[PDB]
Amino acid sequence: ERLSTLIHQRMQEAKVPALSVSVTIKGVRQRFVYGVADVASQKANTLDTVYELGSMSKAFTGLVVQILIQEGRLRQGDDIITYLPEMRLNYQGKPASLTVADFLYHTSGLPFSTLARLENPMPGSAVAQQLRNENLLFAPGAKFSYASANYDVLGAVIENVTGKTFTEVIAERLTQPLGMSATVAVKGDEIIVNKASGYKLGFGKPVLFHAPLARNHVPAAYIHSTLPDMEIWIDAWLHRKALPATLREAMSNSWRGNSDVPLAADNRILYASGWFIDQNQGPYISHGGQNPNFSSCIALRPDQQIGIVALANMNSNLILQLCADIDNYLRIGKY
């Protein structure tokens, strides 16, 4: 009956040690900060607590690509080969031809095996060399198949175009202009102050928190943020028209969904630049983040000025559905 009741109820059902939720509707914002960041040391979850965004990292990566595209530095049509010369991909007998768009919209056809390969930390290996000689499930652009590795390719493209590291580009193009002090793209295994411990469910919640994160996989999964920073993130998207032209235009382009793929009978939703676009009771724009030790969701309904973000320090399927529950509550008072 009450939003706080809904959120609290979902959290204990999810069994996540820490849950952070921010909900804004029509310029009104409520925050829900629950649980403990570290169970062993009993450190309480606070506004300062840092979480891994997981797949919600893709929106930052995707926006930056759109910023480069907006500037004329890059185009969706551009062949992947110029940016990653070493990376050769094969569909059937012959090597496939790929574009920036294929990775942005997950029409690349990259195998599921690629996630494990990208997430595995390699002391010395580039993504192009890492993905070389891979066999595509389908011809590029034929279907939409979600692969986390696609946005790792985009990270490499961003580095190639800019001549800078991914962390530097993220800071210069996004977090500094947006004023997000706590948001950072990690270089690798460097300790982060205030970062929550990560728990992997099953059988009970045990910690898998500290092992080096793969640098190559950061654009897809390892951007780090706080609840207040994600509020700023949500506010910028909702008030994108207030921003500088390049950033504003890039944001509009980032929300444009790729309609040139087959749609399922029960799913006609489109993928944009690190976002899912649903017209039903929409526009409804969302993405979930799922990591081994972290889970998150974000949902935006711009027409009613609705922004929802949830951050948790355990991987839970319920957390992914959590933004949808809150949106239901806002839309019809039910869930």
mmCIF file of C-alpha atoms in Angstrom, residues 57-247:
data_model
loop_
_atom_site.group_PDB
_atom_site.id
_atom_site.type_symbol
_atom_site.label_atom_id
_atom_site.label_comp_id
_atom_site.label_asym_id
_atom_site.label_seq_id
_atom_site.Cartn_x
_atom_site.Cartn_y
_atom_site.Cartn_z
ATOM 1 C CA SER A 57 27.634 0.993 -17.328
ATOM 2 C CA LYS A 58 26.564 0.623 -20.969
ATOM 3 C CA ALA A 59 24.522 3.843 -20.920
ATOM 4 C CA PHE A 60 27.673 5.814 -20.036
ATOM 5 C CA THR A 61 29.668 4.007 -22.721
ATOM 6 C CA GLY A 62 26.819 4.417 -25.231
ATOM 7 C CA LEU A 63 26.358 8.110 -24.476
ATOM 8 C CA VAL A 64 30.067 8.769 -25.031
ATOM 9 C CA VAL A 65 29.895 7.014 -28.416
ATOM 10 C CA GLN A 66 26.956 9.279 -29.288
ATOM 11 C CA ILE A 67 28.979 12.295 -28.154
ATOM 12 C CA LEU A 68 31.775 11.320 -30.543
ATOM 13 C CA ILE A 69 29.168 10.720 -33.261
ATOM 14 C CA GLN A 70 27.568 14.083 -32.504
ATOM 15 C CA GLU A 71 31.002 15.702 -32.900
ATOM 16 C CA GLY A 72 31.555 14.006 -36.261
ATOM 17 C CA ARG A 73 34.510 12.076 -34.879
ATOM 18 C CA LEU A 74 32.634 8.803 -35.304
ATOM 19 C CA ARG A 75 29.706 7.291 -37.219
ATOM 20 C CA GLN A 76 27.474 4.245 -36.644
ATOM 21 C CA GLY A 77 28.151 3.112 -40.205
ATOM 22 C CA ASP A 78 31.937 3.126 -39.764
ATOM 23 C CA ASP A 79 33.661 -0.230 -40.148
ATOM 24 C CA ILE A 80 34.981 -1.719 -36.918
ATOM 25 C CA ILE A 81 38.237 -2.639 -38.691
ATOM 26 C CA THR A 82 39.725 0.865 -38.676
ATOM 27 C CA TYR A 83 39.347 1.174 -34.897
ATOM 28 C CA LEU A 84 40.213 -2.460 -34.119
ATOM 29 C CA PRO A 85 42.419 -3.653 -37.017
ATOM 30 C CA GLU A 86 43.498 -6.851 -35.266
ATOM 31 C CA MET A 87 39.965 -8.078 -34.526
ATOM 32 C CA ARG A 88 38.700 -10.494 -37.173
ATOM 33 C CA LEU A 89 35.299 -12.114 -36.788
ATOM 34 C CA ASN A 90 33.936 -15.007 -38.828
ATOM 35 C CA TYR A 91 30.422 -16.013 -39.787
ATOM 36 C CA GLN A 92 30.370 -19.466 -41.376
ATOM 37 C CA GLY A 93 33.211 -19.935 -43.874
ATOM 38 C CA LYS A 94 34.226 -16.322 -44.338
ATOM 39 C CA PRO A 95 35.070 -13.410 -42.071
ATOM 40 C CA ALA A 96 32.089 -11.181 -41.311
ATOM 41 C CA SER A 97 31.946 -7.439 -41.936
ATOM 42 C CA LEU A 98 31.085 -5.391 -38.839
ATOM 43 C CA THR A 99 30.209 -1.804 -37.910
ATOM 44 C CA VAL A 100 30.044 0.400 -34.810
ATOM 45 C CA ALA A 101 26.246 0.085 -34.943
ATOM 46 C CA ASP A 102 26.374 -3.708 -34.622
ATOM 47 C CA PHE A 103 28.073 -3.448 -31.220
ATOM 48 C CA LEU A 104 25.912 -0.530 -30.040
ATOM 49 C CA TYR A 105 22.687 -2.375 -30.830
ATOM 50 C CA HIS A 106 23.837 -5.926 -30.107
ATOM 51 C CA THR A 107 23.507 -7.107 -33.689
ATOM 52 C CA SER A 108 27.125 -8.310 -33.789
ATOM 53 C CA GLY A 109 26.373 -11.995 -33.243
ATOM 54 C CA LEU A 110 29.156 -12.466 -30.688
ATOM 55 C CA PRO A 111 29.003 -15.787 -28.763
ATOM 56 C CA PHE A 112 27.862 -16.109 -25.137
ATOM 57 C CA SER A 113 31.335 -17.487 -24.404
ATOM 58 C CA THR A 114 32.648 -13.929 -24.848
ATOM 59 C CA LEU A 115 31.336 -12.729 -21.474
ATOM 60 C CA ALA A 116 33.493 -15.201 -19.527
ATOM 61 C CA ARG A 117 36.488 -14.332 -21.706
ATOM 62 C CA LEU A 118 36.065 -10.568 -21.274
ATOM 63 C CA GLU A 119 35.368 -10.739 -17.537
ATOM 64 C CA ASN A 120 38.438 -12.908 -16.956
ATOM 65 C CA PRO A 121 41.304 -10.545 -16.111
ATOM 66 C CA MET A 122 44.123 -10.781 -18.633
ATOM 67 C CA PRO A 123 47.352 -9.085 -17.508
ATOM 68 C CA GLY A 124 48.228 -8.556 -21.183
ATOM 69 C CA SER A 125 45.544 -8.638 -23.875
ATOM 70 C CA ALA A 126 43.511 -6.198 -25.984
ATOM 71 C CA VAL A 127 39.812 -6.797 -26.709
ATOM 72 C CA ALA A 128 40.426 -7.074 -30.467
ATOM 73 C CA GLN A 129 43.152 -9.677 -29.960
ATOM 74 C CA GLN A 130 40.929 -11.209 -27.284
ATOM 75 C CA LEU A 131 37.943 -11.585 -29.644
ATOM 76 C CA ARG A 132 39.960 -12.511 -32.728
ATOM 77 C CA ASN A 133 38.833 -15.571 -34.728
ATOM 78 C CA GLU A 134 35.496 -15.719 -32.924
ATOM 79 C CA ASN A 135 32.573 -17.391 -34.712
ATOM 80 C CA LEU A 136 29.360 -15.388 -35.015
ATOM 81 C CA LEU A 137 25.966 -16.903 -34.195
ATOM 82 C CA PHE A 138 24.430 -14.959 -37.083
ATOM 83 C CA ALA A 139 25.353 -12.459 -39.800
ATOM 84 C CA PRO A 140 25.964 -8.965 -38.383
ATOM 85 C CA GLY A 141 22.723 -6.982 -38.205
ATOM 86 C CA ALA A 142 20.514 -10.026 -38.773
ATOM 87 C CA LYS A 143 19.218 -10.300 -35.200
ATOM 88 C CA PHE A 144 19.293 -8.663 -31.802
ATOM 89 C CA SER A 145 21.244 -10.857 -29.387
ATOM 90 C CA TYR A 146 22.380 -9.250 -26.156
ATOM 91 C CA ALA A 147 26.092 -9.738 -25.482
ATOM 92 C CA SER A 148 27.891 -7.820 -22.743
ATOM 93 C CA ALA A 149 31.125 -7.981 -24.802
ATOM 94 C CA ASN A 150 29.739 -5.610 -27.456
ATOM 95 C CA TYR A 151 30.164 -2.567 -25.204
ATOM 96 C CA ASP A 152 33.705 -3.639 -24.359
ATOM 97 C CA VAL A 153 34.421 -3.318 -28.082
ATOM 98 C CA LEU A 154 32.887 0.163 -27.898
ATOM 99 C CA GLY A 155 35.250 1.043 -25.044
ATOM 100 C CA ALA A 156 38.180 0.146 -27.290
ATOM 101 C CA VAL A 157 36.715 2.253 -30.111
ATOM 102 C CA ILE A 158 36.376 5.217 -27.739
ATOM 103 C CA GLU A 159 40.014 4.816 -26.693
ATOM 104 C CA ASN A 160 41.138 4.501 -30.322
ATOM 105 C CA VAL A 161 39.276 7.616 -31.472
ATOM 106 C CA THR A 162 40.201 9.793 -28.474
ATOM 107 C CA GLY A 163 43.776 8.584 -27.928
ATOM 108 C CA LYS A 164 42.910 8.532 -24.223
ATOM 109 C CA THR A 165 42.047 5.896 -21.628
ATOM 110 C CA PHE A 166 38.407 4.988 -21.055
ATOM 111 C CA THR A 167 38.520 6.381 -17.509
ATOM 112 C CA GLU A 168 39.905 9.685 -18.755
ATOM 113 C CA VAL A 169 37.249 10.024 -21.468
ATOM 114 C CA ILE A 170 34.467 9.140 -19.029
ATOM 115 C CA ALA A 171 35.741 11.761 -16.587
ATOM 116 C CA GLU A 172 36.348 14.488 -19.180
ATOM 117 C CA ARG A 173 33.201 13.950 -21.278
ATOM 118 C CA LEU A 174 30.679 12.850 -18.633
ATOM 119 C CA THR A 175 31.259 12.847 -14.873
ATOM 120 C CA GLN A 176 33.086 16.183 -14.566
ATOM 121 C CA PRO A 177 30.677 18.132 -16.808
ATOM 122 C CA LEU A 178 27.736 16.464 -15.035
ATOM 123 C CA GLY A 179 29.300 17.112 -11.626
ATOM 124 C CA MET A 180 29.269 13.469 -10.514
ATOM 125 C CA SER A 181 32.076 13.393 -7.934
ATOM 126 C CA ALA A 182 31.789 9.731 -6.875
ATOM 127 C CA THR A 183 31.348 8.129 -10.308
ATOM 128 C CA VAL A 184 34.424 6.524 -11.848
ATOM 129 C CA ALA A 185 35.440 3.953 -14.432
ATOM 130 C CA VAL A 186 37.951 1.770 -12.610
ATOM 131 C CA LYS A 187 41.351 1.174 -14.213
ATOM 132 C CA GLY A 188 41.497 -2.261 -12.615
ATOM 133 C CA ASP A 189 42.364 -3.437 -9.111
ATOM 134 C CA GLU A 190 42.649 -0.149 -7.242
ATOM 135 C CA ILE A 191 40.971 0.122 -3.866
ATOM 136 C CA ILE A 192 37.893 2.338 -3.801
ATOM 137 C CA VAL A 193 36.931 4.124 -0.613
ATOM 138 C CA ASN A 194 33.338 3.546 0.499
ATOM 139 C CA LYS A 195 32.775 0.680 -1.921
ATOM 140 C CA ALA A 196 30.258 -1.894 -0.661
ATOM 141 C CA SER A 197 31.323 -5.523 -0.336
ATOM 142 C CA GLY A 198 29.808 -7.762 -3.005
ATOM 143 C CA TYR A 199 27.898 -10.916 -2.179
ATOM 144 C CA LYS A 200 27.002 -13.868 -4.349
ATOM 145 C CA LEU A 201 23.731 -15.545 -3.431
ATOM 146 C CA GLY A 202 23.636 -19.225 -2.600
ATOM 147 C CA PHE A 203 23.386 -21.098 -0.637
ATOM 148 C CA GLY A 204 23.611 -18.168 1.784
ATOM 149 C CA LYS A 205 25.129 -14.782 0.922
ATOM 150 C CA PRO A 206 28.940 -15.276 0.872
ATOM 151 C CA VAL A 207 31.407 -12.552 -0.175
ATOM 152 C CA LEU A 208 33.233 -12.588 -3.535
ATOM 153 C CA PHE A 209 34.206 -8.917 -3.239
ATOM 154 C CA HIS A 210 37.976 -8.481 -3.776
ATOM 155 C CA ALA A 211 39.686 -10.012 -6.800
ATOM 156 C CA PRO A 212 41.034 -7.867 -9.640
ATOM 157 C CA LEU A 213 38.384 -6.616 -12.058
ATOM 158 C CA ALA A 214 39.247 -6.983 -15.751
ATOM 159 C CA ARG A 215 40.123 -3.590 -17.282
ATOM 160 C CA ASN A 216 38.717 -4.519 -20.705
ATOM 161 C CA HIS A 217 35.313 -5.353 -19.240
ATOM 162 C CA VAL A 218 34.829 -2.019 -17.435
ATOM 163 C CA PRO A 219 32.814 -0.236 -20.192
ATOM 164 C CA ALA A 220 30.193 -3.006 -20.060
ATOM 165 C CA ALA A 221 30.134 -3.779 -16.329
ATOM 166 C CA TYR A 222 32.552 -1.971 -13.977
ATOM 167 C CA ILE A 223 31.602 1.687 -13.774
ATOM 168 C CA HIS A 224 31.255 2.615 -10.093
ATOM 169 C CA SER A 225 28.761 5.070 -8.620
ATOM 170 C CA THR A 226 26.679 6.179 -5.640
ATOM 171 C CA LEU A 227 22.954 6.837 -5.241
ATOM 172 C CA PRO A 228 23.351 10.645 -5.222
ATOM 173 C CA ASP A 229 25.492 10.446 -8.385
ATOM 174 C CA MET A 230 22.859 8.291 -10.103
ATOM 175 C CA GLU A 231 20.241 10.875 -9.136
ATOM 176 C CA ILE A 232 22.316 13.473 -10.963
ATOM 177 C CA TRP A 233 22.554 11.029 -13.864
ATOM 178 C CA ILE A 234 18.762 10.586 -13.924
ATOM 179 C CA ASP A 235 18.184 14.345 -13.630
ATOM 180 C CA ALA A 236 20.465 15.082 -16.585
ATOM 181 C CA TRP A 237 18.567 12.647 -18.827
ATOM 182 C CA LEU A 238 15.194 14.024 -17.685
ATOM 183 C CA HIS A 239 16.388 17.616 -18.139
ATOM 184 C CA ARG A 240 18.559 16.931 -21.186
ATOM 185 C CA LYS A 241 17.239 20.044 -22.954
ATOM 186 C CA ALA A 242 18.906 22.262 -20.334
ATOM 187 C CA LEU A 243 22.350 20.888 -21.238
ATOM 188 C CA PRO A 244 24.982 22.037 -23.790
ATOM 189 C CA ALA A 245 24.080 21.230 -27.403
ATOM 190 C CA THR A 246 26.518 18.375 -28.005
ATOM 191 C CA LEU A 247 25.515 16.619 -24.790
#
